[PDB]
Design a protein around this ligand. Structure first.
Ligand SMILES: [Mg+2]
Ligand SMILES: [Mg+2]
Ligand SMILES: [Zn+2]
Ligand SMILES: [Zn+2]
Lengths: 589, 589
DNA sequence: TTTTTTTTT
């Protein structure tokens, strides 16, 4: 038996990273400066430094975590006495446990160990307080004594009151003292297994987890997470008998991850190539032949524009795309790829969606009997991409409910005496089919779309796809068979790198409008408005929302190349793609 | 007087199997490799070796079973001393009990003996944990003692706390320690009697079964199982008085089997026949005369293609068949046969089904008032075949809800704040009648089918059946009367053998496309588009989906012969069969 | 009652 306090402190102060910069030393300095009261330690670093220490942490986690926390607290206090009186104690969290078990394969033998489960967050409860050291008061004409009922022991999960007053050795009734009671933050969350690991013909399972102290509010619903901790059984009503000798299992979260310096370096060198825009476009849906304009348009929606917020109003900075085409034109394949490449995307269908399920659901809690809101599909997709397949197959009554969300990016709910406004800053991608299944050349655009002009004006770009057999049939057949044969096209950025590239660009890039683009946009907008009045029978209208599109598209083009200003070249690209949108629908230039 | 501990040991190690290889020794050796912890014993094997032990097992199971487990553990321990500290005990499961009782014939005299029940699983609860050895601490300021209350006795299904502390002989308050508590896996399932056993008029009855230890998650809902164990009465609140001395019956499962190496050699022998494809086609619906092209198409759907999973998207590998015919053409006859020979099939009707029930339904459980997902018809058919009879009779607004599942093989639900995706990789076979009941040659094909072009393109093959009274009436009449007279057709593979053949092919066979097949497929696909453009009047469209139909059919043809490569011969059959399909819908090539 | 999805007069 050898003390690990010296080894743990030595590991923190002597570990060398990639550049031998003592990374953990900097984290401690950040912890001291910010009073973060929590430290994250990578498991492989501990294993590389000393494999014997790693095994004790994995196995004897129950009794070794407080030892390391106490030793670390002394080191922090030695480094800076001012850290005291602000943080009572620190927490050590281990990340990178080699023991990973699927949510569906949890057995009795795994209870009481430190295991890691990766899943999807579903529900998060509001933060609440849990008592871990109570202070009762035996009220009785002779007692007038207060005491901490749990002696040299933490208050268990089941609340219990003293039976005999220790100060007097007599029975009676006891009163809790909130002022001297010690509390700890407590949150309840529910995790779900990934759809790619669910067995065939079975519904996904769910597991409930506990977040405490600083771990609260570490994630939002719909985010892939990785958690590590100790499993335990759950007790709800143990006071009254009636068998129920079967208990569930809940997880005590110790370390939580969501979804680096080296990644930024990899991303930065990509933008050095002048042809970065073409590479990104060619990397969208590599298994789909042709549709270069559609592929180019989808890339703009992934990056999006720059939202503008003023002292009196705000302007949306998202691009909405509507695609209409004949069946079999691979409209859904691109949408599925978007949902798999975007950092945050939600995939829905017209028939499988409802008005309540798309914006906000008002439900009544049976335990409380009061109404409370539930996040809709658009709300969960805030700051991301919203995909609505088969937009024409949903009822118009439910479809018209998203008019405010598509433009104002807000959802107003006035039901059951509850009034609220929720942010819905998401870009909507919709696909559908013409009124008669296939597009009819002889019939005009009005009866083919079969959609009200109001919703059409909210779409920045509208593309019409036509399945016309011709000279491209032979090359299309070869491409499809190559995909089925396993052959793939190289010189394509992988999905993981592309997803990282999109996330980085949306966070650290904000292009500015220059004078050259201002003149180019104005001339095109005025000229295209003049042609609109020539043929006012088209279902589409050239509204001021169209002028908004050029600014957003130009910003998206600049954001693609990690630029800082909208140059003259970007304005030309925005005009070129805008012309194709007008040309496809039936408006000549 | 006589001990069976040594009797069981020699039976395991000295028992000549069918091939005289000591199969039970191999099973024990296989058990050690992966720590199976469960050994399956055939009742016939015990009866063949020593009849005396057979009666003891079947009549005194509750006593002799633990004794045999101890003997087996020592034998395994000697073979592998390392078997300790991972598997503390093993289990002995007995199958093939001759005592089989119908679910409706259970009486009081059937309680307490080992019986076998055949039925259909309908509900599986999530895996939970049951306490069988608790650990309590007496909360009395003088005690501080830890003890296991269920001493010298397994903890009953009704949880009970001690009234007097064993180590101090005093009453008071007791607390349970989860860390020192011993748990065991516990799962609840519901079984239903087969439709062939339900008597006239009444609805089928249900029985509750309990699965423990490794038996959890041994089967999925909708499967046919054969459970074996001891019946017992169910109690919830025995303390709660107020009459009601009537108790239900719950089933304690000890061994469950769902639905041998001799099958593989028998299956391999069948595939060696060069005319295996013809024999399989002739073995589909032996009671139906004619319809050779329809029989061949149905065989392809049973086997199906090879799904492709890529890093970005996935390609559907199932084949969908649509049949349109006049009444009396026995369309529903093969559909019933398909649902009987397929390893996993679900039979539905257009009128008796709704959109919610087809894919997924969101229902509110009154126990908690919270919405939860319910598996639909397509979800439960994942990995199998879904049959939709009388598709034309059902509502159009309900038919559009399955467009996504038939191509993307996924179901998306956004209702009441619930967003999820479910896999629905199931082949769809549909039948229906024309617009005016009978087919009319004077009217064009477009208005006769009366279906939207979108759903028509999804189907791989569409066959139109016409009832023309000709010279074949006498031949058809004789065949029908022969069936009614008890005469049957010989030299046909039985359903039991055919079902085994199909299951083996779909698992261990994965054909690949060759260069020769690519040229034939590409040339014929181009011919479709050229012919289709020449006649823009047919309601069917030659979309790129038809190209995948050639690939899927070619793979299915190769899979029927247990081949690994799709040769030119398979490609020619794929081209030939679709030529008939095009001819049926009035397209001549 | 009121809001939600569902099958049903
Ligand atoms: Mg689609
Ligand atoms: Mg019929
Ligand atoms: Zn007192
Ligand atoms: Zn005691």
């Amino acid at each position: 038996q050898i003390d690990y306090r010296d080894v743990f402190i030595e590991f923190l102060t002597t570990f060398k990273g990639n550049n031998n910069q003592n990374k953990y030393i900097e984290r401690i300095n950040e912890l001291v400066a910010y009073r973060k009261k929590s430290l994250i330690i990578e498991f492989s670093d501990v294993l590389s430094f000393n494999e014997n220490l790693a095994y004790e942490i994995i196995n004897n986690t129950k009794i070794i975590l407080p030892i390391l926390e106490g030793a670390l607290y002394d080191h922090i206090l030695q480094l800076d006495p001012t850290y005291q009186r602000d943080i009572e104690k620190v927490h050590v969290r281990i990340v990178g446990i080699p023991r990973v078990i699927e949510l569906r394969k949890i057995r009795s033998t795994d209870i009481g160990k430190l295991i890691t489960i990766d899943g999807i967050l579903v529900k998060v409860t509001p933060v609440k307080e849990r008592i871990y050291k109570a202070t009762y008061k035996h009220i009785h004409p002779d007692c007038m004594q207060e005491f901490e009922w749990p002696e040299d022991e933490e208050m268990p999960e089941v609340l219990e009151m003293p039976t005999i007053c220790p100060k007097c050795g007599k029975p009676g009734q006891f009163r809790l003292i909130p002022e001297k009671t010690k509390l700890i933050d407590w949150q309840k969350a529910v995790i779900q297994e990934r759809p790619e690991e669910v067995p065939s013909g079975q519904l996904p399972r769910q597991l409930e987890i506990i977040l405490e102290d600083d771990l609260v509010d570490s994630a939002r619903p719909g985010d892939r997470v990785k958690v590590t901790g100790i499993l335990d059984i759950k007790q709800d009503s143990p006071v009254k008998r009636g068998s129920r000798a079967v208990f569930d299992i809940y997880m005590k979260v110790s370390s939580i991850e969501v979804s680096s310096e080296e990644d930024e370096k990899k991303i930065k060198d990509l933008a050095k190539d002048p042809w970065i825009r073409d590479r990104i476009i060619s990397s969208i849906a590599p298994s789909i032949y042709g549709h270069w304009e559609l592929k180019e348009a989808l890339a703009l929606a992934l990056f999006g524009g720059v939202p503008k917020v003023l002292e009196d109003t705000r302007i949306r900075g998202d691009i909405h795309i509507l695609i209409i085409g004949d069946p079999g034109t691979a409209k859904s394949q691109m949408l599925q790829f978007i949902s798999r490449v975007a950092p945050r995307a939600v995939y829905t269908t017209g028939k499988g969606s409802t008005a309540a399920g798309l914006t906000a659901a008002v439900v009544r809690e049976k335990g409380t009997g009061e109404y409370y809101l539930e996040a809709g599909a658009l709300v969960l997709a805030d700051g991301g991409i919203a995909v609505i397949d088969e937009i024409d197959k949903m009822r118009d009554e439910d479809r018209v409910a998203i008019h405010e969300a598509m433009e104002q990016q807000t959802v107003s709910i006035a039901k059951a005496g509850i009034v609220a406004k929720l942010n819905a800053r998401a870009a909507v991608i919709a696909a559908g089919n013409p009124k008669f299944g296939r597009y009819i050349s002889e019939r005009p655009v009005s009866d083919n779309i079969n959609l009200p002009p109001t919703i059409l004006s909210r779409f920045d770009l509208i593309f019409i796809l036509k399945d016309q057999p011709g000279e491209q049939d032979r090359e299309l057949a070869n491409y499809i068979l190559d995909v089925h044969s396993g052959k793939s096209t190289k010189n394509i950025i992988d999905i993981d790198t592309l997803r990282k590239y999109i996330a980085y660009a949306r966070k650290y890039v904000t292009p500015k409008i220059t004078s050259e683009a201002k003149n180019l946009i104005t001339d095109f907008f005025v000229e295209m408005r003049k042609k609109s009045s020539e043929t006012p029978d088209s279902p589409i209208l050239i509204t001021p929302r169209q002028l908004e599109a050029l600014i957003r598209i130009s910003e998206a083009y600049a954001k693609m190349a990690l630029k800082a200003e909208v140059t003259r070249e970007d304005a030309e690209r925005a005009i070129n793609i805008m012309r194709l949108f007008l040309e496809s629908v039936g408006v000549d230039m």
